[PDB]
Write a protein that binds this ligand. Structure first.
Ligand SMILES: CCCCCCCCCCCCCCCCCC(=O)OC[C@H](COP(=O)([O-])OCC(O)COP(=O)([O-])OC[C@@H](COC(=O)CCCCCCCCCCCCCCCCC)OC(=O)CCCCCCCCCCCCCCCCC)OC(=O)CCCCCCCCCCCCCCCCC
Ligand SMILES: CCCCCCCCCCCCCCCCC[C@@H](O)O[C@H](CO[C@H](O)CCCCCCCCCCCCCCC)COP(=O)(O)OCC[N+](C)(C)C
Lengths: 57, 69
């Protein structure tokens, strides 16, 4: 009672039911380094302008 | 002459106080900024001196024709 698969069937992506638990860290990754903190707050004009040698703005 | 062309000493005195405060604040701010730049360039933890790395959004996380990547 064997029926030969038709053209295009053996190349389907199929689903598999398994009891094997999904591996958690298959890459064996280390802990990622912490990012830099972030930008926050309201923008206030620079104190005493640019402060280039003699410029007051 | 003093009534027509000049003012009292208190005006110049307190204008000098204001000028001195502005200048001293600018001086300490300049020194602090130099120190902050030194630390940000040495450590790389600050917003400044950020050198580009590769965007992780370019990686393709799809099955790669062999099981071991
Ligand atoms: C029309 C006239 C008009 O509309 O004027 C309104 C405008 C109103 O003035 P204001 O803001 O009420 O007055 C504030 C005080 O002047 C107080 O002025 P301040 O404290 O706002 O000064 C602004 C600041 C920034 O100003 C500037 O950088 C440009 C000023 C001209 C620089 C001098 C060279 C050109 C002359 O000035 C400086 O930093 C001085 C440095 C300039 C020298 C640059 C180095 C090279 C010198 C050349 C050798 O007055 C002028 O424009 C006067 C002519 C400029
Ligand atoms: C009584 C007789 C014997 C004694 C004589 C006394 C001699 C005094 C006369 C000499 C004149 C003084 C020289 C002017 C230097 C002063 C310049 C400046 O400091 O004055 C300004 C004031 O302006 C003045 O008007 C000075 C103008 C003087 C210009 C001289 C021009 C004379 C030329 C003569 C031409 C005559 C006709 C020509 C025919 C062809 C100050 O600005 P200001 O923002 O207030 O400051 C705030 C001070 N407050 C609060 C008191 C107001």
């Amino acid at each position: 009672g064997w029926v030969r698969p038709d053209l295009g069937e053996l190349s389907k992506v199929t689903k598999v039911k398994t009891d094997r638990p999904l591996p958690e860290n298959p890459y064996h990754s280390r802990a990622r380094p912490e990012p830099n903190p972030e930008a926050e707050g309201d923008l206030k004009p620079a104190k005493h302008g640019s402060r280039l040698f003699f410029w007051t703005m | 002459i003093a009534r027509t062309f000049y003012d009292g000493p208190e005006k110049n005195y307190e204008k000098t106080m204001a000028i001195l405060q502005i200048e001293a604040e600018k001086a300490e701010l300049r020194l602090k900024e130099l120190e902050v730049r030194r630390l940000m360039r040495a450590r790389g933890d600050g917003p400044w001196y950020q050198y580009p790395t590769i965007d992780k959004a370019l990686i393709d996380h799809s099955p790669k024709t062999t099981p071991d990547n």
